[PDB]
Amino acid sequence: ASTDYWQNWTDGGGIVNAVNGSGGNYSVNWSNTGNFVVGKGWTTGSPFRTINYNAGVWAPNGNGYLTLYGWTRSPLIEYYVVDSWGTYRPTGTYKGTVKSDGGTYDIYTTTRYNAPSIDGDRTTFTQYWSVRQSKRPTGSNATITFTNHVNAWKSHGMNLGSNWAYQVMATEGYQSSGSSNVTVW
């Protein structure tokens, strides 16, 4: 599918050279950053979407995530399906596991306090996570069947909001450096 949304947010720290390439391709070179999120996807997320991607380059030199990323409003929730990471594997309050697309993912919840949200400014909100137990190899055509995650989350009382915001396959970094090149469809 054609992506219709380009996500390029940075808190302003360090260097984030994000390139909006042809079709669903994008690349990022980052150095000594604060927090940033770059990716391509869709303006309106869907719990039924099957996301395809191929990360031709996944080279974080520190804390960085290769992850499906999105938000819902009512309530405000930032969600993640993490396929790979750098030096730090994100974890939180353990809820259970879900097997999807050839991998096993741990399910976690965390809460952010007085942090920037999709609406700008700062607030407190919950984050839902599916984090692969081992890093998914990159360079291949990968699939994330999002419905499997939504359903597993629902079974543990993790319900998404009713107003869907963007949904992208992203590169997120925190006080690190690295490079990524990803194609989404």
Tab-separated table of C-alpha atoms in Angstrom:
chain	number	residue	atom	x	y	z
A	1	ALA	CA	0.000	0.000	0.000
A	2	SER	CA	1.008	3.618	-0.465
A	3	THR	CA	1.973	5.430	2.697
A	4	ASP	CA	0.398	8.861	3.070
A	5	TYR	CA	2.010	10.095	6.241
A	6	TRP	CA	5.534	11.309	7.019
A	7	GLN	CA	6.487	11.528	10.697
A	8	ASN	CA	9.538	13.631	11.517
A	9	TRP	CA	9.650	14.840	15.094
A	10	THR	CA	12.628	15.818	17.228
A	11	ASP	CA	12.877	17.554	20.590
A	12	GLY	CA	15.674	19.616	19.014
A	13	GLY	CA	18.703	17.888	20.468
A	14	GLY	CA	21.671	16.951	18.326
A	15	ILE	CA	21.547	16.064	14.657
A	16	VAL	CA	18.672	14.204	13.003
A	17	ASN	CA	19.066	14.048	9.225
A	18	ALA	CA	15.784	12.505	8.080
A	19	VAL	CA	15.210	11.910	4.379
A	20	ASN	CA	11.715	11.486	2.949
A	21	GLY	CA	12.511	9.128	0.059
A	22	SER	CA	10.454	7.816	-2.860
A	23	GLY	CA	7.375	5.743	-2.132
A	24	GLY	CA	7.515	4.246	1.333
A	25	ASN	CA	11.271	4.633	1.731
A	26	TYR	CA	12.993	6.865	4.273
A	27	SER	CA	16.386	7.106	5.935
A	28	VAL	CA	17.779	8.713	9.053
A	29	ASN	CA	21.314	9.546	10.180
A	30	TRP	CA	21.414	10.745	13.765
A	31	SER	CA	24.088	11.931	16.138
A	32	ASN	CA	24.096	12.838	19.865
A	33	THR	CA	20.381	13.397	19.971
A	34	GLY	CA	17.678	14.062	22.496
A	35	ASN	CA	14.492	12.106	21.616
A	36	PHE	CA	13.196	11.845	18.041
A	37	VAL	CA	10.777	9.716	16.037
A	38	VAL	CA	10.916	9.422	12.256
A	39	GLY	CA	8.884	7.143	10.026
A	40	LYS	CA	6.412	6.550	7.228
A	41	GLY	CA	2.933	5.155	7.381
A	42	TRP	CA	-0.690	6.201	7.467
A	43	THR	CA	-2.527	9.311	8.640
A	44	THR	CA	-5.249	7.221	10.258
A	45	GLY	CA	-4.245	4.039	11.999
A	46	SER	CA	-6.328	0.890	11.911
A	47	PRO	CA	-6.436	-2.143	14.236
A	48	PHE	CA	-6.849	-4.282	11.067
A	49	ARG	CA	-3.804	-3.092	9.123
A	50	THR	CA	-1.008	-5.474	8.158
A	51	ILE	CA	2.242	-3.518	7.957
A	52	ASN	CA	5.091	-4.606	5.689
A	53	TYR	CA	8.615	-3.277	5.887
A	54	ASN	CA	12.199	-4.005	4.966
A	55	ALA	CA	14.940	-2.272	6.936
A	56	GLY	CA	17.851	-2.206	4.494
A	57	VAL	CA	20.015	-0.575	7.167
A	58	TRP	CA	19.502	-0.888	10.932
A	59	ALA	CA	22.635	0.417	12.623
A	60	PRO	CA	21.964	2.056	15.985
A	61	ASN	CA	25.070	2.960	18.024
A	62	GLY	CA	23.154	3.213	21.268
A	63	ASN	CA	19.497	3.472	22.296
A	64	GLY	CA	17.210	3.236	19.262
A	65	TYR	CA	14.057	1.256	18.322
A	66	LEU	CA	12.845	-0.133	14.978
A	67	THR	CA	9.148	-0.213	15.793
A	68	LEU	CA	5.550	0.151	14.652
A	69	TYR	CA	4.456	3.363	16.357
A	70	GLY	CA	1.192	5.182	16.731
A	71	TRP	CA	-1.354	6.954	18.872
A	72	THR	CA	-5.004	6.929	19.774
A	73	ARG	CA	-6.966	9.646	21.575
A	74	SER	CA	-9.869	9.070	23.999
A	75	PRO	CA	-7.927	7.875	25.801
A	76	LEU	CA	-4.480	9.133	24.851
A	77	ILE	CA	-2.249	6.097	24.251
A	78	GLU	CA	1.179	5.820	22.580
A	79	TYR	CA	1.711	2.262	21.321
A	80	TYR	CA	4.627	0.205	20.040
A	81	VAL	CA	5.395	-3.123	18.359
A	82	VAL	CA	9.182	-3.291	18.686
A	83	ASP	CA	10.992	-5.636	16.271
A	84	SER	CA	14.565	-4.560	16.934
A	85	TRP	CA	16.547	-2.203	19.130
A	86	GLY	CA	20.060	-1.020	19.867
A	87	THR	CA	21.741	-1.291	23.232
A	88	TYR	CA	18.565	-1.156	25.330
A	89	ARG	CA	15.572	-3.497	25.152
A	90	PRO	CA	12.476	-1.594	26.310
A	91	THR	CA	10.538	-3.236	29.143
A	92	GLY	CA	7.805	-2.274	31.609
A	93	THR	CA	5.080	-3.991	33.631
A	94	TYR	CA	4.830	-7.522	32.220
A	95	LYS	CA	1.356	-8.577	31.058
A	96	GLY	CA	1.926	-11.713	28.990
A	97	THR	CA	3.119	-12.750	25.514
A	98	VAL	CA	1.796	-12.941	21.972
A	99	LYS	CA	3.172	-14.958	19.062
A	100	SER	CA	2.838	-13.199	15.728
A	101	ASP	CA	4.608	-13.188	12.364
A	102	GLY	CA	7.156	-15.806	13.387
A	103	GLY	CA	8.190	-14.138	16.621
A	104	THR	CA	7.243	-14.117	20.305
A	105	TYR	CA	6.629	-10.728	21.885
A	106	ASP	CA	6.433	-9.741	25.543
A	107	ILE	CA	3.550	-7.390	26.362
A	108	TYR	CA	4.253	-4.443	28.672
A	109	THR	CA	2.612	-1.281	29.922
A	110	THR	CA	4.366	1.854	31.109
A	111	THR	CA	3.285	5.390	31.960
A	112	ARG	CA	4.917	8.663	30.913
A	113	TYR	CA	4.692	11.634	33.285
A	114	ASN	CA	4.703	15.265	32.097
A	115	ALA	CA	6.000	14.211	28.687
A	116	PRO	CA	5.366	15.601	25.193
A	117	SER	CA	2.400	13.977	23.485
A	118	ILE	CA	0.894	14.033	20.021
A	119	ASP	CA	-1.135	17.168	20.899
A	120	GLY	CA	1.941	19.187	21.825
A	121	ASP	CA	2.623	20.501	25.336
A	122	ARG	CA	3.088	17.934	28.136
A	123	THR	CA	0.854	15.430	29.884
A	124	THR	CA	0.663	12.020	31.551
A	125	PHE	CA	-0.276	9.047	29.356
A	126	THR	CA	-0.055	5.273	29.091
A	127	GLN	CA	2.123	3.378	26.616
A	128	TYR	CA	1.303	-0.124	25.330
A	129	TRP	CA	4.179	-2.302	24.118
A	130	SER	CA	4.750	-5.572	22.292
A	131	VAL	CA	8.544	-6.115	22.376
A	132	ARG	CA	10.084	-9.044	20.485
A	133	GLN	CA	11.983	-11.413	22.805
A	134	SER	CA	14.957	-11.519	20.413
A	135	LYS	CA	15.829	-8.994	17.683
A	136	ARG	CA	14.172	-9.639	14.344
A	137	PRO	CA	16.836	-9.967	11.611
A	138	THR	CA	16.791	-6.984	9.251
A	139	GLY	CA	17.273	-6.723	5.496
A	140	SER	CA	14.314	-8.991	4.761
A	141	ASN	CA	10.648	-8.405	3.947
A	142	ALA	CA	8.942	-8.397	7.352
A	143	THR	CA	5.302	-8.342	8.319
A	144	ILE	CA	3.563	-7.047	11.422
A	145	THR	CA	-0.024	-8.365	11.647
A	146	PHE	CA	-1.237	-5.623	13.957
A	147	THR	CA	-4.585	-7.241	14.638
A	148	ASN	CA	-2.808	-10.038	16.592
A	149	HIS	CA	-1.300	-7.432	18.922
A	150	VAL	CA	-4.521	-5.462	19.363
A	151	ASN	CA	-6.348	-8.676	20.268
A	152	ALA	CA	-3.681	-9.890	22.693
A	153	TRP	CA	-3.605	-6.459	24.322
A	154	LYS	CA	-7.401	-6.481	24.676
A	155	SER	CA	-7.191	-9.846	26.473
A	156	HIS	CA	-5.021	-8.208	29.152
A	157	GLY	CA	-7.301	-5.204	29.609
A	158	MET	CA	-5.191	-2.936	27.367
A	159	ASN	CA	-7.849	-1.212	25.299
A	160	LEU	CA	-6.974	1.354	22.673
A	161	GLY	CA	-8.718	4.717	22.309
A	162	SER	CA	-11.607	5.311	19.926
A	163	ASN	CA	-10.007	8.129	17.923
A	164	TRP	CA	-7.127	6.845	15.794
A	165	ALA	CA	-4.181	9.081	14.953
A	166	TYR	CA	-1.188	8.225	12.731
A	167	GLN	CA	0.413	4.772	12.491
A	168	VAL	CA	3.976	4.442	11.160
A	169	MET	CA	6.951	2.067	10.946
A	170	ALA	CA	9.473	4.169	12.804
A	171	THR	CA	12.993	4.704	13.954
A	172	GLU	CA	12.991	6.228	17.480
A	173	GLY	CA	16.169	7.245	19.269
A	174	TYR	CA	17.122	8.592	22.666
A	175	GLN	CA	20.504	10.209	23.386
A	176	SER	CA	22.283	8.124	20.779
A	177	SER	CA	23.696	8.027	17.239
A	178	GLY	CA	23.123	5.704	14.312
A	179	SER	CA	21.641	5.104	10.873
A	180	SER	CA	18.580	3.409	9.424
A	181	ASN	CA	17.022	2.989	5.997
A	182	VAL	CA	13.531	1.504	5.930
A	183	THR	CA	10.898	0.882	3.252
A	184	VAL	CA	7.247	0.593	4.355
A	185	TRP	CA	4.188	-0.695	2.459
